RNA sequence: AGGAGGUGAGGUUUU
RNA sequence: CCGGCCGGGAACUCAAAGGAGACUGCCAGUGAUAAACUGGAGGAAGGUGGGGAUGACGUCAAGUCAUCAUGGCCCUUACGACCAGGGCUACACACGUGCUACAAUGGCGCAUACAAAGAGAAGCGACCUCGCGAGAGCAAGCGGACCUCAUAAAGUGCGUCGUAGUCCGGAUUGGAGUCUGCAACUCGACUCCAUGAAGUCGGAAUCGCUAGUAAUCGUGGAUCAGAAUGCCACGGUGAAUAC
């Protein structure tokens, strides 16, 4: 615990924010609480569908949610059977009219959240941590990424003593801010305890 | 924090919002310079009979996620740990660590 | 310190006489950044010393500084487990700094009612070759001459 | 201390109990928990056992104790030296 | 023809306007003696004019804001030097020799976390 | 130079001199001087006797050493006899206004005393 | 005689918004005083980073609320309708007043 | 670069 | 109408947006024709121009099961739930971190200049009246380069004290009061009238600091109905020394 969050340190330069709405002191707390509620609802409902990111905006006292996911067909439904329900519940929670947008995440193996969730699912399904890490690293390195690092910590293999294992392939410069670093974490709850997974992906430096 | 603590906080908020006007009237009567010396006494007599939870001074500001009383920030409505956790991921707009 | 060579910094001269030794003296005498009070005290003391001794303020300060100035100082060598205090010649800048520091300490230890009066009396005594400042100088010289056997 | 214009503070649950006893003459030791209330002249002559935290300490109110807070006459923490 | 100069310091800013005249000085609708009580400030402001003999030939009007007495004096001196450089441009080689052309850059260092001051670390004991 | 039964120094100014009495400070000295029409740059000496007489008359309006201490002692004894918390703290020799007794209570505890 | 204040968190998004507003004004009118930058609100927070005993380790965050002002001297009815008509992206709030 | 002359807490334990 | 106030201006500070610039780029010398080192030419900055964030595989089975999540154990008419009072502020003591000081480079009285950075809608609270004073009343303005907080202080000039436990020191204590808060006793803050302790530069030993740094002087903010000498930032004066 001596490392800083790359996504939090690259907010100003490269990485965008997950919430681009404006308010004042009187509304900031309420907006953050509503965003937390809707994010908790979405991450609990769309668990099967590979969901990557949720951006929230509040223009003209209305809420615009944009879900970047890898399974738009099952996220939406047959002809709007689930997206309409999601819009209705989001509008009911926020007290304002809602507009939901869907974005497709091409190359799902290059997204930190999806890979971390897959690793967590495999760990809770009793798949080998080393095998999962090697498969994920190889897939992410062959689909066109310039570097990947995967770390797994805590009660590996049902042992009585925790440990921290990790794999690296390529280059993952964390001290370079202009570098396009995608980082995320995940937690698996197995009968032997809790296991933490962290993923860093490098997508090339940015100029501008 | 604790479900009991959160229930106490929400009950106190509801009572304060219910009895805000009645207590304000009594406070105005007490603070009024030109008022009956017996009416001003009956004002405090009636005021001290109201439930103590109906006072804004008895409700503590906690985190809307956990309920931690210490480290609370009013603008964000969360504790210091949760504010940092949200900022590092980007849920809070324009909250970037800087230097000068 | 250990590696770098320290270049000196520009020191602003005083306006009353256009010198730099007076500016260094008022900087040494200054505490908590009270440069205005230090300058006023120094100017009053210099005026009193000049009207006492007939000389000018700058000449009186120079002769007092020359009288207080030492030439050698005892320092530890520590070849092995030995506390050998070996004498060595002192640069003029450090001589002036030590003289000013000793004058300030003597003025502070003086029992008069005003710091300006204490400083003026100490400067007069230094010019007349007396006082605790010249006693400290004599003690340093005696220690150096006792340790003269060490090169 | 308390603002002079507001006046002394006293709880109704003790005010009623003392104003009844004033005419009732039931000088048996009353019991109370409100040690934050002032002492009125009508209380003089009665015995009140006030809650110090564990039990009720009895106090006989006198003339010299009017403006003093009631809780001042009941020790809270036991101490006898080392 | 009115020449202009600007000077800065830690937190001060001074605009100086120079005109050919008889050396009178106006600062914030006042005078140098009434404004700067200490004469070290007067020495600082007149130092360029003492270095190059143009005291009794330039009437100047100065507006200053921010900082303290020394900061305002330094900003005024810098503005006067810039105005003189605009006036003649042949005095730059001499002013830079004494250090008047070069611009002050020392600023109040910010306070940090865990230290009672900019560099004053708290006391240590085992 | 004798006021209220005590002696008063002569080389000091009137305001400082009046503060030597138990119950008179700078405010109660300046008020007396203003009421009696006496400046503050003058000393006890260099003054007539009518000024001192009217100064004593104006001082008599207040409470001074003879009655000042009696009132304080009576209040302390009343508190101790009543048995209030403040009176008990005075009996024990501890701060009465509300402070810390774990550390930094030397003024009431007296000098340091080990086991 | 009509003043609009725009507050945002991005100096580029607010610049785009005020440029669009200036273009709309130049289309449906003229005599625009131009975008004038107003002082930025630097709101700073200092929080702890450990859930336990660590005082010297803290994180300092800041929020830079950028502010712009636009004044229009010929507020025609069509210009006012278009200004109320057009909407801006999130993260920018616009207050419109007459004065 | 080769040959010659010296040259270190005087002591200070256990875990 | 003496106040940028009112016509007026895009010149200036300044408010922010985009750019230039500082990169060993040149000159001379040394260096193994190199890297590299010393000086100076220009230049606002010369060698990382200053400061800050950013803290490599890893140790300390280091800390947090009481931010939170969670494997396992534990009670489920109580290790759960509600309320009143008290306690977390005790006290023969020992320790750390800081504040006030021990005094003339000063205390006190009058007069008078120069700032920066921030907060404000259950809020900031002008002007005026009253109270010596904390503050009370009517009541504008401001969601804020506009209005309030908010007078900056140290500083300077003119006087007094004249080396004393002092016109230093304000501890402690008594009385009378103000504000917030249903409710200031055990325990809030502040004002006035008095009281005016110990202390006169501090033992072994030890701490921080190499420049706008140390030292010193004020200001603001988070927390908060009210409650910091603490914490986080801001500027004013401003060093000595480094063989
Ligand atoms: Mg870190
Ligand atoms: Mg780096
Ligand atoms: Mg829980
Ligand atoms: Mg509270
Ligand atoms: Mg600390
Ligand atoms: Mg420590
Ligand atoms: Mg206390
Ligand atoms: Mg043994
Ligand atoms: Mg050079
Ligand atoms: Mg352990
Ligand atoms: Mg525990
Ligand atoms: Mg405690
Ligand atoms: Mg004086
Ligand atoms: Mg008045
Ligand atoms: Mg003064
Ligand atoms: Mg005093
Ligand atoms: Mg007093
Ligand atoms: Mg260093
Ligand atoms: Mg508060
Ligand atoms: Mg400072």
Swiss-Prot record, chain B:
Q: What does this protein do?
A: Binds 16S rRNA, required for the assembly of 30S particles and may also be responsible for determining the conformation of the 16S rRNA at the A site.
Give one GO term, molecular function aspect.
Answer: rRNA binding
Q: Which family does it belong to?
A: Belongs to the universal ribosomal protein uS14 family.
Query: Which keywords annotate this record?
Result: Ribonucleoprotein, Ribosomal protein
InterPro entries per record = Ribosomal_uS14, Ribosomal_uS14_bac/plastid, Ribosomal_uS14_CS
Could you tell me which SUPFAM superfamilies the record lists for this protein?
A: Glucocorticoid receptor-like (DNA-binding domain)
Q: What is this protein called?
A: Small ribosomal subunit protein uS14
Gene Ontology cellular-component terms listed: cytoplasm; cytosolic small ribosomal subunit; small ribosomal subunit
Superkingdom, natural source: Bacteria
Q: How does it assemble?
A: Part of the 30S ribosomal subunit. Contacts proteins S3 and S10.
Offer one Pfam family short name for this entry: Ribosomal_S14
Q: Which PROSITE patterns match?
A: RIBOSOMAL_S14
Q: Which organism is it from?
A: Escherichia coli (strain K12)
Q: Which GO terms describe its biological process?
A: cytoplasmic translation; ribosomal small subunit assembly; translation
Curated annotation (Swiss-Prot), chain E:
Coiled-coil annotation: which residues?
A: none
The family database entries (InterPro entries) matched by this protein are listed as:
Ribosomal_Su5_D2-typ_SF, Ribosomal_uS9, Ribosomal_uS9_bac/plastid, Ribosomal_uS9_CS, Ribsml_uS5_D2-typ_fold_subgr
Q: Name one GO biological process term.
A: cytoplasmic translation
Report which superkingdom the organism of origin falls in.
Bacteria
A GO CC annotation recorded here is: cytoplasm
Which key words tag this protein in UniProt? Ribonucleoprotein, Ribosomal protein, RNA-binding, tRNA-binding
Transmembrane as UniProt keyword: no
Q: Sorted alphabetically, which Pfam families does this protein's record hold?
A: Ribosomal_S9
| Molecular function in Gene Ontology | RNA binding; structural constituent of ribosome; tRNA binding
Q: Does the keyword tRNA-binding apply?
A: yes
Report the family membership.
Belongs to the universal ribosomal protein uS9 family.
Assembly, per entry: Part of the 30S ribosomal subunit. Contacts 16S rRNA. Cross-links to the P site tRNA and weakly to the A site tRNA.
Q: What does this protein do?
A: The C-terminal tail plays a role in the affinity of the 30S P site for different tRNAs. Mutations that decrease this affinity are suppressed in the 70S ribosome.
Record NCBIfam families: PRK00132.1
Q: What is this protein called?
A: Small ribosomal subunit protein uS9
* Natural source organism: Escherichia coli (strain K12)
Source species taxonomy: Bacteria, Pseudomonadati, Pseudomonadota, Gammaproteobacteria, Enterobacterales
Q: Which gene encodes it?
A: rpsI
UniProtKB/Swiss-Prot annotation, chain F:
What InterPro entries does its record include?
Rbsml_uS13_C (IPR027437), Ribosomal_uS13 (IPR001892), Ribosomal_uS13-like_H2TH (IPR010979), Ribosomal_uS13_bac-type (IPR019980), Ribosomal_uS13_CS (IPR018269)
GO terms, molecular function: rRNA binding; structural constituent of ribosome; tRNA binding
UniProt GO BP? cytoplasmic translation
Region feature (Disordered):
93-115
Question: Which Pfam family, giving just one, matches this sequence?
Answer: Ribosomal_S13
Q: Which domain of life does the protein's organism represent? A: Bacteria
Q: Which GO terms describe its cellular component?
A: cytoplasm; cytosol; cytosolic small ribosomal subunit; small ribosomal subunit
What keywords are annotated for this sequence in UniProt? Answer: Ribonucleoprotein, Ribosomal protein, RNA-binding, rRNA-binding, tRNA-binding
Q: Does this entry carry the keyword Translocase?
A: no
Entry-linked Gene3D superfamilies: 1.10.8.50, 30s ribosomal protein s13, domain 2 (4.10.910.10)
Presence of the UniProt keyword tRNA-binding in the record: yes
Give the function comment from the record.
Located at the top of the head of the 30S subunit, it contacts several helices of the 16S rRNA. In the E.coli 70S ribosome in the initiation state was modeled to contact the 23S rRNA (bridge B1a) and protein L5 of the 50S subunit (bridge B1b), connecting the 2 subunits; bridge B1a is broken in the model with bound EF-G, while the protein-protein contacts between S13 and L5 in B1b change. The 23S rRNA contact site in bridge B1a is modeled to differ in different ribosomal states, contacting alternately S13 or S19. In the two 3.5 angstroms resolved ribosome structures the contacts between L5, S13 and S19 bridge B1b are different, confirming the dynamic nature of this interaction.
Q: Which family does it belong to?
A: Belongs to the universal ribosomal protein uS13 family.
UniProtKB/Swiss-Prot annotation, chain G:
InterPro entries found in the cross-reference section:
Ribosomal_uS10, Ribosomal_uS10_CS, Ribosomal_uS10_dom, Ribosomal_uS10_dom_sf
What GO cellular component term, any one, is given? Answer: transcription elongation factor complex
Q: Which domain of life is it from?
A: Bacteria
Query: Would you tell me the protein name for this molecule?
Result: Small ribosomal subunit protein uS10
**Is the keyword Transcription regulation in the record?**
yes
- Family under the similarity heading: Belongs to the universal ribosomal protein uS10 family.
- Check the record and name the PROSITE patterns matching this protein: RIBOSOMAL_S10 (PS00361)
GO biological process per UniProt: cytoplasmic translation; regulation of DNA-templated transcription elongation; ribosome biogenesis; transcription antitermination
Quote the subunit structure annotation.
Answer: Part of the 30S ribosomal subunit. Can also form a heterodimer with the transcription antitermination protein NusB. Binding of S10 to NusB is mutually exclusive with its incorporation into the ribosome. The rRNA transcription and antitermination complex (rrnTAC) consists of RNAP, NusA, NusB, NusE (this protein), NusG, SubB, ribosomal protein S4, DNA and precursor rRNA; S4 is more flexible than other subunits.
**One Pfam family cited in the UniProt record for this chain:** Ribosomal_S10
Q: PANTHER family in the record, alphabetically?
A: 30S RIBOSOMAL PROTEIN S10 FAMILY MEMBER
The alphabetical list of record keywords is: Ribonucleoprotein, Ribosomal protein, Ribosome biogenesis, RNA-binding, Transcription, Transcription antitermination, Transcription regulation
The entry lists its GO molecular-function terms as: structural constituent of ribosome; transcription antitermination factor activity, RNA binding; tRNA binding
